[PDB]
Amino acid sequence: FHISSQQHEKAIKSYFDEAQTQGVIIIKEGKNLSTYGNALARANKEYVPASTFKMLNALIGLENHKATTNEIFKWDGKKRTYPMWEKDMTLGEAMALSAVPVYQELARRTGLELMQKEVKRVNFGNTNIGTQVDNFWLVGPLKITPVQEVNFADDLAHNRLPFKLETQEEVKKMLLIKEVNGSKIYAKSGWGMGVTPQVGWLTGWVEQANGKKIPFSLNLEMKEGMSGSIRNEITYKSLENLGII
Numbered sequence: 050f051h052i053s054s055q056q057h058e059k060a061i062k063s064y065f066d067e068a069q070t071q072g073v074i075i076i077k078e079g080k081n082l083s084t085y086g087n088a089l090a091r092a093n094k095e096y097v098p099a100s101t102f103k104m105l106n107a108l109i110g111l112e113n114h115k116a117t118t119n120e121i122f123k124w125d126g127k128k129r130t131y132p133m134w135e136k137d138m139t140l141g142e143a144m145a146l147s148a149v150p151v152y153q154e155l156a157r158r159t160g161l162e163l164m165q166k167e168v169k170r171v172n173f174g175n176t177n178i179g180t181q182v183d184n185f186w187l188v189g190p191l192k193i194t195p196v197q198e199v200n201f202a203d204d205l206a207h208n209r210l211p212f213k214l215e216t217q218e219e220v221k222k223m224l225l226i227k228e229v230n231g232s233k234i235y236a237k238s239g240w241g242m243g244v245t246p247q248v249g250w251l252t253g254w255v256e257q258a259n260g261k262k263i264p265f266s267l268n269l270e271m272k273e274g275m276s277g278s279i280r281n282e283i284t285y286k287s288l289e290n291l292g293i294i
């Protein structure tokens with residue numbers, strides 16, 4: 050449609066301005082990184098990964114036989130943050146619901162020693178998990194930049210992470226969040242509420258009908274009374290604006 054670069058940049062900036070926050074979205078086409086939004090310097094700043102870490106948590110647990118994809122993690126009957134989490138679920142269902150307690154159980158099964166060795170082997174973010182195996186991705190000290198998140202998504206989309214092909218495919222199946230005219234969007238959201246300022250993520254890739262995979266990572270400041278779906282809305286509008294979906 051012969052739209053200028055300046056127009057795409059202004060349009061995507063306006064999506065973040067209109068949400069009254071500050072954020073970036075990084076897109077990778079082949080080997081080229083493009084950064085859009087209203088706070089471009091966020092691209093190389095470190096933030097806690099929050100629930101985006103569930104992707105790597107699942108890879109590590111499955112690869113090291115701490116769970117299977119069919120295993121049901123039973124609700125223990127204790128009050129959880131959301132009623133929707135007060136049920137028995139597989140890793141895949143827990144992924145879609147972002148169910149922290151299930152992923153905490155998986156991290157505890159893995160254990161601190163194996164988790165640190167695996168996070169190092171994958172070279173995820175600053176690779177530091179500290180000494181608490183069940184919350185390091187929520188409150189620190191683990192941190193990652195939006196550029197590193199988009200590169201992680203690109204490696205996963207292409208089966209390039211240091212895990213069996215089968216492990217990567219099993220986790221990818223858990224991440225399908227939308228279909229749009231022959232395009233499929235795979236992504237994981239994150240919301241770091243236990244850090245200030247709060248951080249929101251949506252990191253994934255578009256698989257186009259022709260098979261091409263386009264990784265992205267949205268990163269923004271979450272604020273009071275903001276809905277979680279703003280992450281999806283900004284991401285989808287940006288991807289549509291760029292003709293990616």
Ligand SMILES: *C(=O)/C=C/N[C@@H](C(=O)O)[C@](C)(Cn1ccnn1)[SH](=O)=O
Nearest residue numbers: 099100130149187239240241242243
């Ligand atoms: C993944 O990003 C899950 C985040 N869960 C948050 C939330 O949903 O608000 C809680 C509060 C856990 N969390 C995030 C940061 N510090 N704690 S929820 O699981 O109780």
